[PDB]
Design a protein around this nucleic acid. Structure first.
Ligand SMILES: [Zn+2]
Ligand SMILES: [Zn+2]
Ligand SMILES: [Zn+2]
Ligand SMILES: [Zn+2]
Lengths: 56, 75, 120, 147, 85, 97, 183, 48, 450
DNA sequence: ACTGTCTGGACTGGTCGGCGCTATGATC
DNA sequence: GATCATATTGTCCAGACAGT
């Protein structure tokens, strides 16, 4: 299983929107980054909770 | 697509588009809209340009991605 | 319209509603602000505890007895009967005057001494 | 004598008719008759042997636009030259609109109508309290016939 | 109403005209003009510098138009030292 | 102090990039975002009275089934133009989920 | 009339409630959303008891909140036409008397309170019968059936309830007992 | 609110009140165009 | 909750719907009086909306800038053929009998065409082909299959003139002008079951609605009025067209109520028809376009919708956006391909709205404490409830002390921020890319050479 | 069934800057 | 003098249509 570019962008956008209005970060933060960077590090650490629904 | 050669203009692919707003936005806006009013056509807004005109997300790229979330997040 | 669709609809009685409102009051007491509910829910709980004629389990038993006794009545009729708790023909008549059926004196009497069982 | 229509500027049909009369008097025109009813706005009628005389008589006046090609039958304008009060045909209980007067641009309902005093009595529909007022019969226009 | 700000009229004289050789910035008032109200207090219709433009007021000319009304033309100069772009 | 035009070509290349939410933010959320009241019974634009404090559909009634829809003000102007051109657009509302 | 309903609905949980249990968060959202309002086909939404089943969340575009398909129990109150109910008079003013029967307050007309020209006493807010000589005071249990419900607004207070009381067999509990004694 | 102005052609000082001016012109030569004189308040200009 | 437009259904507005949607009735062909106030019953009536800031709308009670506008209706003295449907009307006039009103097809043919319509599906081309075939088949029948009444050919003259080729008792062939009232009466006789054969919806596209009896005047907001620099209000072209329409309609009503002869009534009817046709579309072929007093032709709703400058292209498909800058580009090999040179003046103007969280609270607090005149700073602060406050010198420290989790800070453009970089014309999707902000104190943009 | 003719529509996008216009012949 | 109703009704390509 692999993540497409559109799916990854949607996941990062949803995670950043969640972080902006709540949703505390599941990993450490560099104390000053934007929520988009927080979502990027969450994706890089493989800790994101958001899945992708695919038709079948 | 329909078994005959069609152009890309108002008399071709755009002409047989199922969306009223897609046909009206490109060419012959007045007569296309009036003919749609005559026929009582229903626009399902399944295209891209109609969602652009309205404000709904387009059905291409990230607009087709569906996401699921597990609520009990415990960091 | 509450929600997208309704699955089950039941005509609940006064006693069970009072129990549910007491549970909501306990939940609000567990909630940090001192106000459990709004004005309408608190006033409803006060009215229910003022008109708490029967215990919730006694009300449930009476309602199920009414439901199993006859067939033309519904949950609303049984709930209204257990709410009023009739004793004679007058209140039964003023309840069923505008209803679809004006019950005969025999079935009215049988409803009456079904009702007055374990009646406070 | 055939009746033709001359279109003129609204509100000054009488002035154009007087100008045409003066032109006919001082220019020897074969004009037979000129009519300008007050109810008809922006047009006048000319009884002339032919339309050519009509367009020649109205020529040179900037307030006369054109002459309609058709010919008006005399039965159409027969009712115009008839002695009849403006209050005739108005029955109480209907709704009228007041053209002029202090109540300009107001809808009302007719209560009393008389032809001897050339006046009519109307109650304002927008008034919360019913207060009848009197207004000239020619100052109202029927909008819906009802009893 | 319509008062842009206290500091925007700091370069104006008592006649509502800007003094020459005065440094100006964006939205700075050059000619103080008041208009009669539509259909209240007098409106504000002062001529101001463009928001993205600045410079120094080079000259002020007072004259009349063809109808005899007053006309004030303010020429403002800005030094353009060459730079990137 | 005018804005910068995001023309048809810019929208086309944003579609080609596959950026749906970026296009939504550019064309809608930053230019003419607005909210309207729509009647679910007939699709007409409902009227909201601040004095009465209530939202209702004048062509239809329906004081209950009225929903708030977020859309561009240009789309509302287009709907008004269509109504002025004796064309009735009926907005069939759908749930977001 | 009190009612218990099982309602399936989409509940929106904001990201600030992610750390909490999904059932508790859905219950909190439903309580802050639906409680205290009036529904045309349901009545006075009184309380949300619990949430039985919840589903996996779905994130819609343009919103970080999570939407869950949840089934829950709602306790509501629906006034019915020609329905009898017992209450207590809580407010009296000359044109009519207000009685509490539940979440709403029913209005009983002074003309139609009894088949007698009952006078309102402004000294102590009392109702005095001219011929029957029956005194109506605050805190008296009464029974009446409803004839008019106004559902023109979604606010409970703005809704109006009018009942009927001139029919025999209604009124105060003492009045009903006295009528039963004659029969 | 009267003020002094400089004529465009003759250059002599012209005195008039713009608030209540029925007509603004230089009476000395009839010129209808006037220049606002530069104020004597010291201004500071950065050298390049 | 929130709802989205799942689908749009199109149709023809019925006169009853126009009357119900109208908040006012317009009869005065004027906009403002001498003092500038709106005239009651006019086009600028407060019941249709408010543009001037002082006024308050009568229908909804809202001030200017928030009132959506409300439509009005004008009761025409005589029906007027809609030009956009006019040719289509002629098609119906060539398909339905003049007496019975049914289509000129047999019952078996009608049933077969119904099966053909049901079978093919939803492709537009097949529907248009079937409609054209049905119209061609019905237009060549001079005898009604249901009533047997004779039929006459109908000649369509552009834009809204209909001629019926009739025969006198002597066999001479002449042309009778079909008035819009007669056309509407003929269209009213067509039942709902024959409408799908003509390509009309029984409940949405009734043919009688194709002839205008009530004219929907647009809201004030959609045709706004502005005040020029000379103090004279500048009316819109649509406002002038509606003024002319109202004046002609009032003259026609006055002449009808006065018992004017037929020459008057048809002439005023033709004038009103021309005015309504120009109001629907001023570029209609065969008629002179409506012109202003200065000789400038007006653009009506059709020109507002169509064209490069129209609503569809100039306002809907493409529109001006906020938070955008534009300036000259200069080379900068010292930056990466991922980076764009953003000037300090541009960076301090364009603001990124960043929500205050537990990890960026100190940075956003420092941005607020810097202010709009110090880089890196902030320009606006939005509370969780939703009130936006502009940061000045006075409240710069007060807002910073009031900053908490959930607040939004519109901070200046910082290094590493993602922005779009587009050059026009955008021939391909590679004509815009997302770069990283690099802030330099010069004035021009800087883009890497590759 | 072919053939020339009449009618209708579109004519790349964006930006900087300016110029200039949007009443009048009767009436008291 | 200060107001006021009215103020006219360039080429090329493609689809539909009388004519032979
Ligand atoms: Zn509706
Ligand atoms: Zn001089
Ligand atoms: Zn309004
Ligand atoms: Zn027939």
């Amino acid at each position: 299983f692999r993540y497409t570019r559109f799916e990854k962008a949607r996941i990062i956008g949803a995670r950043a929107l969640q972080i902006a209005m709540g949703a505390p970060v599941l990993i450490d933060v560099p104390e000053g980054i934007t929520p988009l960077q927080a979502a990027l590090l969450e994706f890089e650490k493989g800790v994101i909770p958001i899945t992708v629904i695919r038709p079948s | 697509l329909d078994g005959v050669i069609r152009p890309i203009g108002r008399h071709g692919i755009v002409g047989e588009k199922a969306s009223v707003l897609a046909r009206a936005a490109f060419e012959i806006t007045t007569q296309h809209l009036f003919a749609a009013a005559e026929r009582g056509e229903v626009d399902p807004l399944n295209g891209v340009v109609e969602n652009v005109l309205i404000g709904q997300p387009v059905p291409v790229g990230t607009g087709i991605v569906k996401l699921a979330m597990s609520l009990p997040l415990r960091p | 319209m509450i929600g997208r669709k309704k699955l089950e609809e039941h005509y609940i009685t006064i006693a069970e509603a009072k129990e549910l409102l007491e549970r909501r009051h306990a939940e609000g007491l567990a909630e940090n602000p001192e106000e459990p509910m709004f004005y309408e829910a608190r006033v409803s709980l006060e009215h229910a505890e003022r008109f708490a004629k029967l215990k919730p389990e006694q009300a449930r038993e009476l309602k199920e007895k009414l439901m199993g006794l006859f067939d033309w009545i519904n949950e609303r009729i049984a709930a209204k009967l257990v709410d009023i708790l009739p004793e004679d023909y007058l209140d039964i008549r003023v309840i069923f005057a505008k209803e679809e059926y004006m019950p005969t004196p025999e079935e009215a009497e049988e409803i009456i001494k079904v009702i007055d069982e374990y009646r406070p | 004598g055939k009746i033709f229509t001359v279109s003129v500027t609204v509100g000054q049909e009488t002035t154009t008719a007087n100008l045409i009369y003066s032109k006919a008097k001082t220019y020897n025109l074969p004009l037979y008759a000129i009519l300008s009813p007050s109810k008809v706005k922006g047009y006048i009628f000319i009884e002339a042997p032919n339309k050519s005389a009509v367009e020649e008589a109205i020529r040179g006046i900037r307030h006369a636009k054109r002459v309609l090609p058709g010919e008006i039958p005399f039965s159409e304008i027969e009712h115009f030259l008839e002695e009849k009060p403006a209050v005739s045909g108005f029955e109480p209980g209907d709704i009228v609109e007041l053209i002029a007067g202090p109540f300009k641009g107001e809808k009302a309902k007719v209560v009393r109508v008389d032809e001897s005093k050339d006046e009519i009595v109307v109650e304002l529909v927008s008034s919360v309290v019913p207060i009848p007022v009197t207004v000239r019969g020619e100052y109202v226009r029927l909008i819906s016939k009802r009893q | 109403q319509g008062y842009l700000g206290e500091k925007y009229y700091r370069h104006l004289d008592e006649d509502g005209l800007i003094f020459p050789e005065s440094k100006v910035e964006g939205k700075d008032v050059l000619v103080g003009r008041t208009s009669p109200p539509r259909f209240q207090g007098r409106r504000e219709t002062s001529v101001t510098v463009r928001p993205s433009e600045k410079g120094v007021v080079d000259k002020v000319i007072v004259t009349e138009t063809g109808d005899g009304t007053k006309l004030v033309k303010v020429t403002v100069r800005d030094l353009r030292i060459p730079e990137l772009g | 102090e005018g804005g910068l035009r995001f023309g048809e070509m810019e929208r086309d290349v944003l579609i080609g990039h596959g950026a749906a939410m970026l296009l939504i933010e550019r064309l809608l959320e930053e230019s003419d975002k607005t909210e309207v009241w729509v009647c679910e019974s007939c699709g007409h634009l409902a009227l909201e009275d601040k004095r009465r404090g209530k939202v209702y559909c004048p062509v239809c009634g329906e004081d209950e089934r009225i929903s708030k829809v977020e859309m561009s003000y240009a789309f509302k102007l287009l709907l008004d133009e269509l109504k002025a051109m004796v064309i009735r657009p009926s907005l069939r509302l759908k749930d977001r989920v | 009339m009190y009612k218990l309903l099982k309602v399936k609905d989409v509940v929106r949980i904001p990201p600030r409630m992610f750390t909490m249990d999904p059932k508790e968060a859905a219950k909190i959202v439903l309580r802050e959303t639906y409680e205290g309002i009036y529904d045309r086909d349901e009545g006075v939404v009184l309380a949300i008891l619990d949430v039985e089943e919840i589903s996996e969340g779905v994130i819609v575009p343009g919103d970080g909140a999570t939407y869950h398909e949840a089934i829950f129990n709602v306790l509501v109150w629906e006034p019915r036409n020609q329905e009898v109910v017992e209450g207590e008079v809580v407010e009296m003013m000359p044109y009519g008397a207000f009685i509490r029967i539940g979440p709403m307050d029913g209005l009983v007309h002074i003309s139609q309170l009894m088949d007698d020209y009952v006078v309102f006493d402004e000294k102590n807010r009392q109702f005095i019968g001219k011929e029957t000589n029956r005194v109506l005071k605050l805190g008296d249990y009464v029974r009446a059936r409803i004839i008019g419900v106004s559902v023109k607004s979604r606010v409970i207070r703005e809704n109006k309830i009018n009942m009927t009381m001139r029919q025999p067999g209604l009124g105060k509990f003492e009045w009903i007992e006295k009528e039963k004694k004659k029969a | 609110a009267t003020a002094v102005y400089r004529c465009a052609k003759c250059g002599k000082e012209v005195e008039l009140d713009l608030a209540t001016a029925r007509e603004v012109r230089c009476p000395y030569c009839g010129s209808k165009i006037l220049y606002k004189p530069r104020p004597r308040v010291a201004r500071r200009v950065k050298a390049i | 909750m929130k709802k989205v437009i799942g689908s749009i259904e199109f149709g023809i507005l019925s006169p009853q719907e126009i009357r119900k949607m109208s908040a006012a009735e317009i009869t005065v062909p004027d906009t403002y009086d001498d003092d500038g106030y709106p005239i009651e019953g006019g086009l600028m009536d407060k019941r249709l909306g408010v543009i001037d800031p002082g006024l308050r709308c009568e229908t909804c009670g809202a001030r200017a800038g928030e009132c959506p506008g409300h439509f009005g209706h004008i009761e025409l003295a005589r029906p007027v053929i809609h030009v956009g449907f006019a040719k289509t009307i002629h098609r119906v006039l060539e398909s339905t009998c003049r007496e019975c009103g049914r289509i000129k097809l047999t019952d078996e043919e009608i049933e077969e065409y119904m099966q053909k319509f049901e079978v093919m599906g939803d492709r537009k081309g097949a529907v248009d082909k079937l409609i054209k075939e049905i119209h061609k088949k019905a237009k060549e029948r001079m005898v009604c299959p249901h009533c047997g009444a004779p039929q006459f050919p109908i000649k369509f003259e552009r834009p809204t003139i209909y001629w019926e080729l009739r025969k006198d008792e002597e066999g001479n062939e002449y042309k009778h002008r079909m008035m819009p009232s007669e056309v509407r009466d003929r269209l009213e006789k067509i039942p709902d079951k024959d409408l799908p054969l003509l390509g009309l919806h029984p409940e949405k596209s009734r043919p009688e609605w194709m002839v205008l009896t009530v004219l929907p005047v647009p809201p004030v907001t959609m045709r706004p009025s502005i005040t020029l620099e000379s103090g004279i209000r500048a009316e819109d072209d649509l406002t002038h067209k509606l003024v002319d329409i109202i004046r002609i309609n009032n003259r026609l009503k006055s002449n009808i109520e006065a018992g004017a002869p037929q020459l008057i009534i048809e002439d005023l009817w033709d004038l009103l028809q021309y005015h309504v046709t120009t109001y629907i579309n001023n570029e209609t072929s065969g008629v002179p376009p409506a012109k202003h007093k200065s000789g400038r032709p007006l653009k009506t709703l059709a020109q507002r919708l169509k064209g490069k400058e129209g609503r569809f292209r100039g306002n809907l498909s493409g529109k001006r956006v906020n938070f955008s800058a534009r300036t000259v580009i200069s080379p900068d090999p010292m930056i990466s391909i991922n980076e764009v040179g953003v000037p300090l003046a541009v960076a301090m103007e364009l603001t990124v709205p960043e929500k205050v969280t537990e990890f960026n609270y100190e940075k956003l607090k420092q941005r607020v404490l810097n202010g709009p005149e110090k880089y890196p700073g902030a320009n606006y602060v939005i509370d969780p409830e939703g009130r936006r406050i502009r940061l000045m010198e006075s409240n710069r420290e007060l807002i910073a002390e009031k900053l908490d989790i959930g607040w939004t800070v519109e901070r200046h453009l910082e290094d590493g921020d993602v922005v779009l970089f587009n050059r026009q014309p955008s021939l391909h999707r590679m004509s815009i890319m997302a770069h990283r902000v690099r802030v330099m104190p010069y004035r021009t943009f800087r883009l890497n050479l590759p």
